[PDB]
Amino acid sequence: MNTVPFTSAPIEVTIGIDQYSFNVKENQPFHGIKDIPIGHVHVIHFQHADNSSMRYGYWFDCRMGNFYIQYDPKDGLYKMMEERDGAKFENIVHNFKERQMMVSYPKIDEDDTWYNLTEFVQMDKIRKIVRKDENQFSYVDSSMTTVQENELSDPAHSLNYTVINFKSREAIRPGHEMEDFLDKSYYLNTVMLQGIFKNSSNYFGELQFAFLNAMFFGNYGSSLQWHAMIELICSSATVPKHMLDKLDEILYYQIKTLPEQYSDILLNERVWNICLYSSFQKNSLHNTEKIMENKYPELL
C-alpha cells in the first residue's frame, strides 16, 4: 500500500481520491492519504472552498515514483511533485503515519468499483492523451479543451483524445457513403481498432478515462468523447461479441457510480436513447439498459 503525503493544507479544500471525497479546513493538520491500493491508476483531485471554479487534479500510479502534494501560494493550487530521494520520502511518510495525520483510502474489501472503472486505463496511455513528458503524473482540470474542440486554444494544455467524427473522410470510404454512414463497422473495426488503437483494450481505456475526467472534473470535452466512443460501437452492426459484453460491464459500473444529481449534465439524452433503443446494439447491453431504466427513467 502506497502513500501521497502533503506538506500542509493552507487553504480550505474538498479533496477527492478516485470515487471518494472529504473536506479539509484552512490550516488543518492534514498530511495526506495512505493505504492507496497498488495495482491501479489513481486520481487525486481538488475543489477549493473559496472558489469552486477550476476543479483540477492529477492522475498517477504509485508504482512509477514517490509523489507528494505542496500548495503553491503563487499559482494558487495544490501541486503534485515527485521526490527522487527514497529514504527521505520514507522518513517523511513514517513521521506523518506515526502522528496519525493521514486519512486512510477507505476501500471496502467486497468493493471492486475502482477496478471496474479503471480496468483498461493505463498510466502510459494517460500520458499520451495529456502531454507533459517531464512528469510521471498527469494534470487535468475542468476547463482543458480537447484537440477536437480546438479544431472547431493553447495546444500544450489540451486533451489529445482520438478524434471521432462521423461525417469525415476518415469515417466514410469513397463509394461506400450510405453503407459507412448507416453502419459504422468499417470506421470502428478497420480505422479505429486495427489502425489507431491496435486493440479493444486501448479503446476501452480511453473511453474509461474520458468518463472519469467528465465525472471528476466536469470536463465537457471528455464527456463528448465518452459519448462518441459509445455511439461508435452501438452504431456498428459488426462488433466482436467479447467487446459488446465488456462494454455492457463498463457502462453498467459507470452509470452505477455517477452522482444521481449530475445526471442532467453528464448524460446525453440523444446518444443514450439511440444506443439503448434504436441502434444495432439496442439488445446487446442488458445490464446497462436495466440500470439506466431503474436509475434514470426520465432521461429515457
Binding site: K167, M178, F181
Partner: protein, 237 residues
C-alpha cells in the same frame, strides 16, 4: 444556414447555386395482389436540380431498374439522389460548380453532406421556403421524357424558356413557382388556363406557351385566382 424569405434575393446573386428536389425520385403505384395483400410497383422518377438564376435544369431520370432487388427504397432514394448530385458536380468544370446546394427536404442534408465531403467549400443548406417542385411532372414535356426512358439518362432544359430576355431572374422564379404551385393545387384547371387559347402555342424548343408580356399578366392573375379558389374550396371560406 437555412434559406428563407429574409435572404430571398440571395438566390439571384452571382454565386452559382442549385436547388435539389428529391420528391419525384422514388415513385410508386399501390395495388392489391391476387391474395388480397398490398404491393407497390415503381415507375420512373427524376431528380430536379435547378439553377434559379439561369433556369438551367439538370433532370436526371431515375429508371425503375435502379430499385431492382434493393431494400428500404425510400431511404436508398435519398442516397441515390445525393450520389447523382455529387456526380453532376464532379462532371461540371470547376468554374461551373456550385458554391451552395439548397435541398428542399431536410432529410437530404446528411446524404448530400456525406457524398460531398470531397467538396468542403460547397455549402449544403436547407430552406424554409415551401417550394412546389414536386409538380415538375405536371409539365408535359418533362413527364414525357421521364416516362419514355428505358435506361438512366440526364436531360438538360431551361425551365424559364426565353423569359430572361425580358424579365429578371427574380421575376422568372416567381413566375415559375406560381405556375408550379397552381399545377400542384389543381393540375387540370392550371393546364386549361395555359392552353385554353389555341392561338398561343408552345415552341418545339420550349416548355411553356409563347405568351406576350400582357398575356403573362393575365395568366398570372388566373393562376392566383385558381390558388385562392382552391384554398376557399379546401377550407370552406
Amino acid at each position: 444556414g437555412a434559406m428563407n424569405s429574409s435572404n430571398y434575393a440571395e438566390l439571384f446573386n452571382n454565386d452559382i447555386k442549385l436547388f435539389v428536389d428529391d420528391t419525384n425520385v422514388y415513385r410508386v403505384t399501390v395495388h392489391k395482389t391476387f391474395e388480397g395483400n398490398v404491393a407497390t410497383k415503381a415507375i420512373n422518377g427524376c431528380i430536379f436540380t435547378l439553377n434559379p438564376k439561369t433556369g438551367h435544369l439538370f433532370l436526371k431520370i431515375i429508371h425503375t431498374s435502379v430499385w431492382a432487388g434493393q431494400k428500404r427504397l425510400s431511404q436508398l432514394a435519398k442516397w441515390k439522389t445525393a450520389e447523382e448530385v455529387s456526380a453532376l458536380v464532379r462532371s461540371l468544370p470547376k468554374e461551373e460548380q456550385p458554391k451552395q446546394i439548397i435541398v428542399t427536404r431536410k432529410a437530404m442534408l446528411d446524404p448530400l453532406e456525406v457524398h460531398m465531403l470531397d467538396f468542403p467549400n460547397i455549402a449544403i443548406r436547407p430552406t424554409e421556403l415551401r417550394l412546389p417542385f414536386s409538380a415538375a411532372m405536371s409539365i408535359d414535356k418533362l413527364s414525357d421524357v421521364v416516362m419514355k426512358a428505358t435506361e438512366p439518362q440526364m436531360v438538360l432544359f431551361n425551365i424559364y424558356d426565353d423569359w430572361l430576355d425580358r424579365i429578371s431572374s427574380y421575376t422568372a422564379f416567381s413566375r415559375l413557382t406560381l405556375l408550379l404551385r397552381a399545377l400542384k393545387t389543381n393540375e387540370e384547371s392550371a393546364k386549361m388556363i395555359l392552353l385554353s387559347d389555341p392561338t398561343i402555342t408552345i415552341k418545339s424548343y420550349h416548355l411553356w406557351p409563347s405568351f406576350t408580356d400582357e398575356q403573362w399578366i393575365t395568366i398570372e392573375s388566373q393562376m392566383r385566382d385558381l390558388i385562392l379558389t382552391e384554398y376557399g374550396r379546401k377550407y370552406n371560406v
